[PDB]
RNA sequence: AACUUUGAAGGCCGAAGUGGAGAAGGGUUCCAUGUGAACAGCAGUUGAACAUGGGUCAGUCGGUCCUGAGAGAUGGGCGAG
RNA sequence: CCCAUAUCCGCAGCAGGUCUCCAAGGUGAACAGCCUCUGGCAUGUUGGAACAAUGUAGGUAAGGGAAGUCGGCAAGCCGG
């Protein structure tokens, strides 16, 4: 605490804010800044970053949206935030309880990003994922640098600007969805062309179907083709991408709604909701990041004593080399286990393989949210004390009991939320859905934030 | 628990954590009124006690 | 007393609903003009003759 | 329980008079 | 809000009042009386004498029963007293008076209290229980006081011992602000 | 913070008690949490105040039944009524 | 739940009034008074510093012993 707090203190004395508004902005005045706000952020995602030629495959930065100001994208400021929420929940760093140690504790969260900012290019520059700093230099380096950390350092002050109510919501959430959402219409009527020994067709799958419908003679091989691209976006990935968006928005609003009120004024009755997804999609993230890596790390294991069996059990590994690039596939064992399905085929194959990773898939998701809960400080002990430093409480009850009463409920959203996070998310990597079942989640999410406040103004709008 | 988590938090690094998620919130409030009152009967007097009977006849 | 018939503590009961301060939101009414319940009542100040 | 756990408690807690303004909320650290 | 003077330069001057306060009327005006005219760093200094029995108020006007006491010989006067809730009332205002003199920007070593007045403030109504059943009132007898600052050309600064304390956090204050944010 | 709480002292009521329970009367004063504006003839961080919510579970404990001193219909009598 | 020097009646948290049950050790004739254990309390709607007069409530007085006063009022003597 005391050599965190204060070593905090003099940078953020230097550091710019964005100022309160004076009074409670207009709506028409809100849309202007939101509306103004996302088109930076969207002509950042596609303006080319300076001066990277050598490797990201300078072809692809012509097609791609990957090279982008936004190349580091919104991760930083998601990971700052996380990484503090995380210590700071597990009170392993301690947080100033006052407003104005809030209001630096927000520079500080803020503070993280710009070190992410930093930390996550020079990790991509020295591997050469824009290329040898040698062949860049200082120069170009330090363009490079300002240049990713301008906009990860405008897109702060774009989303701090939301946040305080010159626009709508948050900005990190607006961004992540536009990007999803238009990753799906992308994919539907992307005008791309694609040179195939079967000649140049386009790739936008609507604007696919047209263009293979007039172009084939065989307008059944038309049927067949233009849906079943196994290289290439299909209309039935739009399919089943859209057959998800429905179930996602029917378990979007399940919650369970608890009566509150507060303890010092009569009536005033509210409501405390114990959403479905309790953990968010935090779950599965912490689990997939988890799986990929035991994929890195076996490769590496088993390279080195393979000729035991117990290394070899654990999970093997092979080099897929006919024809594409070297891509690192497992070949048995545990790893292979925790694998998903490429084909639909696959999974009649091997009936036990395919039962085994969902249960994995499935308890993962479900075991993270039960243990995340606590650690991450929305226990019901802490969210009583949340209730009761906002003087609420359940009626009829002692402020003890509402503990009991939240139990009932939470440790049991929190899995089953997770375990329903993870059953829906098969069927997105299952199905070919755009996005996996995190994407659909957090589009749909925030569109229907955004939808209940716009009614709202819509009400005197 | 706290070891998990943190194997997690050392994965989530390199290439895998353009993948994330957002936060969660729950505050909220209301408004306040401070009015009073409570009444009570209204007094009464005049007893008539007075005790000096000193009879000058 | 505890020894109590149905009649009085009926008769109690209701004036222990009647003894409590009004809804805040009646003072945003068009035509309002009360301030407070002016009614209220206290055990030991005021007493109910029966 | 040892009933002479009352007379320790209660000489210990009379040592706060040399440590007035940093007395420790809970001495039982563990957990 | 109306004071019953205006400032001679009201640029140079800062304002403080307070109404219904429950501070004793005559003892307070005994005590404004007092400090009339004083520079700001010696009327805080000399009503904290007053709070320690180091420095009389001379009871001039309301003065029935009032004893006597050494300290009074300093105002030429024989009957003194030492009003504890009046002389830390007008700390209060002396403070927030200060402050507005910061917010303002005027050179708050420099401020002498230029006007000082303090008026009855409707009175608030309890009771006494007397002989042979009757009942009689029991009045408090507050005040509204007004002050106005102004600079002028004797500086005195603030002493080195006062400015050396910590900054008070109030726990209370927090709780509140917990509850609007 | 003289007055609240905990600890330690020194004292008092001294089993016809300043103890533990009831009848009549009170009627929520009971219990938990919060406030410290008004009230509690100083103060209070406290309260039997105020505010928000709770709490009284019976075949067997009483009522309910009996009749006591008495009260009181019908028949009848009186009575302008 | 209170059941009463603060939950009842006396205009009030009023030295008044208001029906009962249980009932320890010592001294002692004793449910007397005095001290104590169980249980309870915080001195009774405030505190601090002084220790004038005059009070209110307690005491003690040489020698005399009702001479005081309407009157031994008051106190005192006696006391198991
Ligand atoms: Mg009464
Ligand atoms: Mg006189
Ligand atoms: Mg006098
Ligand atoms: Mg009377
Ligand atoms: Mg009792
Ligand atoms: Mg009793
Ligand atoms: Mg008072
Ligand atoms: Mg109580
Ligand atoms: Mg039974
Ligand atoms: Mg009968
Ligand atoms: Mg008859
Ligand atoms: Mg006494
Ligand atoms: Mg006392
Ligand atoms: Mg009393
Ligand atoms: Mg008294
Ligand atoms: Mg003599
Ligand atoms: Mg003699
Ligand atoms: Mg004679
Ligand atoms: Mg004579
Ligand atoms: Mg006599």
């Not at chain 1, 503090?84 to 407003?99: N, S």
């Not at chain 1, 604007?207 to 065989?218: K, S």
């Not at chain 1, 009829?396 to 409920?409: A, D, F, I, K, P």
């Amino acid at each position: 605490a005391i050599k965190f707090l204060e070593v905090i203190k003099p940078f953020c004395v230097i550091l710019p804010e964005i100022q309160k508004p004076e009074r409670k902005i207009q709506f028409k005045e809100k849309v202007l800044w939101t509306a103004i706000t996302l088109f930076i952020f969207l002509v950042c995602c596609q303006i080319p970053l300076f001066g990277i030629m050598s490797s990201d495959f300078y072809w692809m930065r012509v097609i791609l949206n990957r090279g982008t100001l936004m190349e580091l994208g919104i991760s930083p400021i998601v990971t700052s935030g996380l990484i503090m929420q995380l210590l700071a929940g597990a009170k392993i760093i301690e947080v100033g309880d006052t407003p104005k140690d809030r209001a630096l504790f927000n520079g500080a969260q803020k503070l993280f990003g710009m070190i992410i900012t930093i930390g996550q290019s020079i990790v991509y520059v020295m591997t050469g994922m824009y290329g040898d700093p040698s062949e860049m230099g200082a120069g170009i380096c330090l363009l490079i640098t300002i240049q990713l950390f301008v906009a990860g350092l405008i897109v702060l002050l774009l989303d701090e600007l939301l946040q305080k109510g010159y626009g709508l919501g948050s900005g990190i959430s607006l961004f992540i969805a536009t990007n999803i959402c238009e990753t799906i219409v992308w994919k539907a009527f992307s005008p791309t062309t694609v040179n195939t020994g079967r000649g140049m067709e386009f790739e936008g799958a609507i604007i696919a179907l047209f263009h293979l419908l007039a172009t084939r003679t065989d307008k059944v091989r038309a049927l067949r083709e233009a849906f079943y691209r196994q290289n290439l976006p299909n209309l039935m990935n739009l399919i089943a991408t859209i057959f998800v968006f429905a179930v996602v928005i029917y378990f979007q609003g399940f919650r369970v709604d608890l009566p509150i009120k507060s303890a010092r004024y009569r009536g005033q009755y509210n409501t405390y909701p114990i959403k479905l997804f309790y953990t968010s999609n935090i779950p599965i993230i912490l689990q997939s990041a988890l799986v990929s890596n035991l994929y890195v790390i076996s490769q590496m294991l088993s390279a080195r004593f393979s000729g035991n069996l117990l290394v070899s059990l654990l999970g093997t590994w092979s080099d897929t080399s006919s024809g594409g690039p070297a891509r690192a596939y497992p070949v048995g064992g545990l790893c292979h286990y925790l694998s998903p399905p490429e084909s639909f085929g696959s999974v009649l194959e091997d009936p036990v393989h395919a039962v085994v990773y969902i249960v994995f898939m499935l308890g993962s998701c479900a075991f993270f949210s039960k243990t995340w809960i606590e650690v991450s400080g929305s226990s019901a002990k802490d969210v009583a004390k949340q209730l009761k430093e906002q003087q609420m409480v359940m009626r009829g009850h002692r402020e003890t009991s509402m503990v009991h009463e939240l139990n009932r409920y939470i440790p049991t959203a929190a899995a089953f939320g997770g375990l329903c996070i993870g059953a829906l998310s098969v069927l997105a990597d299952f199905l070919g859905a755009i996005g996996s079942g995190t994407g659909i989640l957090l589009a749909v999410t925030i569109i229907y934030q955004y939808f209940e406040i716009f009614v709202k103004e819509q009400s005197e709008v | 628990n706290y070891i998990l988590l943190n194997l997690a938090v050392a994965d989530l690094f390199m290439v895998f954590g353009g993948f994330t998620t957002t936060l969660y919130t729950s505050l909220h409030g209301y408004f306040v009124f401070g009015p009073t009152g409570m009444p009570g009967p209204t007094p009464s007097g005049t007893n008539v006690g007075s005790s000096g009977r000193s009879p000058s006849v | 007393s505890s020894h109590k018939t149905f009649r009085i503590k009926r008769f109690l009961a209701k004036k222990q609903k009647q003894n409590r301060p009004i809804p805040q939101w009646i003072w945003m009414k068009t035509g309002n003009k009360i301030r407070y319940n002016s009614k209220r009542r206290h055990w030991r100040r005021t007493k109910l003759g029966l | 329980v040892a009933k002479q756990r009352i007379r320790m408690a209660n000489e210990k807690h009379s040592k706060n008079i040399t440590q007035r303004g940093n007395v420790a909320k809970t001495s039982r650290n563990a957990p | 809000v109306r004071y019953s003077l205006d400032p001679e330069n009201p640029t140079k001057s800062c304002k403080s009042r307070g109404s219904n306060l429950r501070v004793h009327f005559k003892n307070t005006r005994e005590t404004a009386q007092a400090i009339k005219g004083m520079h700001i760093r010696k009327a805080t200094k000399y009503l904290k004498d007053v709070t320690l029995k180091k420095q009389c108020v001379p009871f001039r006007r309301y003065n029935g029963g009032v004893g006597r006491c050494a300290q009074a010989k300093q105002w030429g006067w024989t009957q003194g007293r030492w009003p504890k809730k009046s002389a830390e009332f007008l700390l209060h205002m002396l403070k927030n008076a200060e402050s507005n003199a910061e917010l303002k920007g005027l050179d708050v070593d420099s401020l002498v209290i230029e006007h000082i007045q303090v008026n009855k403030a409707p009175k608030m109504r309890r009771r006494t229980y007397r002989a042979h059943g009757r009942i009689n009132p029991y009045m408090s007898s507050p005040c509204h006081i007004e002050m106005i600052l102004t600079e002028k050309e004797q500086i005195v600064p603030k002493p080195e011992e006062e400015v050396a304390q910590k900054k008070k956090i109030s726990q209370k204050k927090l709780k509140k602000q917990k509850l609007m944010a």
